[PDB]
Design a protein around this ligand. Structure first.
Ligand SMILES: *[C@@H]1O[C@H](CO)[C@@H](O[C@@H]2O[C@H](CO)[C@@H](O[C@H]3O[C@H](CO)[C@@H](O[C@@H]4O[C@H](CO)[C@@H](O)[C@H](O)[C@@H]4O)[C@H](O)[C@@H]3O)[C@H](O)[C@H]2NC(C)=O)[C@H](O)[C@H]1NC(C)=O
Ligand SMILES: *[C@@H]1O[C@H](CO)[C@@H](O[C@@H]2O[C@H](CO)[C@@H](O[C@@H]3O[C@H](CO)[C@@H](O)[C@H](O)[C@@H]3O)[C@H](O)[C@H]2NC(C)=O)[C@H](O)[C@H]1NC(C)=O
Ligand SMILES: OCC1O[C@H](O[C@@H]2OC(CO)[C@@H](O)[C@H](O)[C@H]2O)[C@H](O)[C@@H](O)[C@@H]1O
Ligand code: NAG
Ligand code: FE
Ligand code: ZN
Ligand code: ZN
Length: 341
């Protein structure tokens, strides 16, 4: 009832969820699945209540009747007065990032190069860049465009997984969960940083959070912002400070979804959970911080300031916006009134 079952994707999120569970006095409990799609199915069956999803998955979930409940909100600049929970979301910038040293690589010479994607079906890592590439190429053979990639969630024996590395034992290659070394925003940026790929499709924030000492992780220690460039759609390369004028799209923020019949209850529990474990929460950083996990973005993104209420009781189509929704519909004609399960 006032007990919510959260769905965790893979073993590291499970571990974080368990801690949250313990600290919440079991107001929150945990179910675990190997992929986000499987978590969506748990939610449909009523065996889990909720999870926080990237926009590409909100589209999947939406067709099956799930609804957005609250949205990640990061630090803003305009609307200084408003409380975080009431502040409108701004959205993130999807970018394509390369090494400065890889000169003469631009948007127009990406063909046959190596790519790093957060996961198949995700906004910045897949839907935006592959949608543009299909568009520009006039062809649904997006699996042939790059020579090799790491795109968690594709066929492990395909060239889309050739660059994925699996877990510290080499198992679970290309699975779309954090066990895969190059999964997610951080994984795809690591894939570029280690020069496994030529380009990473991530968001603007990922570059800043993993360079110039912001990350203490071994692979990101010595990374410098100046060693990276953004690829712009006009064929130019720009410094990472110019993301405002050099992105592939603005993406809708990740948001918590649930079955509509459970939305109201998930919302109230979460609002109270963040008062306890959120940014300035009563027990964070004392006992547990919901929005921390050492740059690994477990359950929620680490840069989340709060979960915010949605202005308008959005359907998922309204939450995603008509320009994003049509982009996805078009790309999925290669790979409408449905539910995949
Ligand atoms: C692309 O993404 C980056 C990363 O999100 C965006 O850069 C962020 O811009 C914010 C303003 O919108 C900065 O906000 C404030 O944050 C703090 C405190 O208020 C200040 O500096 C911080 O100091 C502490 C030191 O302990 C650290 O936690 C932080 O790393 C940072 O050094 C800052 O003066 C400012 O008031 C925010 O810092 C900043 N994030 C980083 C890491 O630089 C960027 O706007 C975005 N670009 C676009 C076009 O969206
Ligand atoms: C890949 O190309 C397809 C085909 O063009 C793109 O789909 C098209 O997107 C545009 C812009 O969102 C749609 O037009 C819009 O119509 C509304 C309503 O009139 C208007 O308010 C907007 O100003 C705009 O004109 C268009 O309907 C849509 N076309 C199709 C076939 O549905 C798609 O966006 C491209 N993918 C990417 C990632 O850009
Ligand atoms: O993509 C930007 C963005 O918009 C979101 O929702 C909304 O987008 C439109 C039209 O583009 C609209 O109709 C809305 O009213 C609207 O709010 C996001 O979810 C979001 O966070 C974005 O950043
Ligand atoms: C658990 O939820 C109950 C019901 O609102 C509430 O009394 C209590 O504050 C919650 N405990 C924690 C630690 O979240
Ligand atoms: Fe995303
Ligand atoms: Zn723009
Ligand atoms: Zn509406």
């Amino acid at each position: 009832y006032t007990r919510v079952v959260w769905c965790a994707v893979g073993p590291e999120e499970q571990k974080k969820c368990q801690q949250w569970s313990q600290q919440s006095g079991q107001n929150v409990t945990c179910a675990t699945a190997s992929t986000t799609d499987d978590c969506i199915v748990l939610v449909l069956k009523g065996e889990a209540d909720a999870l926080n999803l990237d926009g590409g998955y909100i589209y999947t979930a939406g067709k099956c009747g799930l609804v957005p409940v609250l949205a990640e909100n990061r630090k803003s600049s305009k609307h200084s007065s408003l409380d975080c929970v009431l502040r409108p979301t701004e959205g993130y910038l999807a970018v394509a990032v390369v090494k400065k040293a890889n000169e003469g690589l631009t948007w127009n010479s990406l063909k046959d190069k190596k790519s790093c994607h957060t996961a198949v079906d995700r906004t910045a890592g897949w839907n935006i860049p592959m949608g543009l590439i299909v568009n520009q190429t006039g062809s649904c053979a997006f699996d042939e465009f790059f020579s090799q990639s790491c795109a968690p969630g594709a066929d492990p024996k395909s060239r889309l997984c050739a660059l994925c590395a699996g877990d510290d034992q080499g198992l679970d290659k290309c699975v779309p969960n954090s066990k895969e070394k190059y999964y997610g925003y951080t994984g795809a940026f690591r894939c570029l940083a280690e020069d496994v790929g030529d380009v990473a499709f991530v968001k603007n924030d990922t570059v800043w959070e993993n360079t110039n000492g912001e990350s203490t992780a071994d692979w990101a220690k010595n990374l410098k912002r100046e060693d990276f460039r953004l690829l712009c759609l006009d064929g130019t390369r720009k410094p990472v400070t110019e993301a405002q004028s050099c992105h592939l799209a603005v993406a809708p923020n990740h948001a918590v979804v649930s079955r509509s019949d459970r939305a109201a209850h998930v919302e109230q529990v979460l609002l109270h959970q963040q008062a306890l474990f959120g940014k300035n929460g009563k027990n964070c950083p004392d006992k547990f911080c919901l929005f921390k996990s050492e740059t690994k973005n477990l359950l929620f993104n680490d840069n989340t300031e709060c979960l915010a209420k949605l202005g308008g009781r959005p359907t998922y189509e309204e939450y995603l916006g008509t320009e994003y929704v049509t982009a996805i519909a078009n790309l999925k004609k290669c790979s409408l009134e449905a539910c995949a399960f």
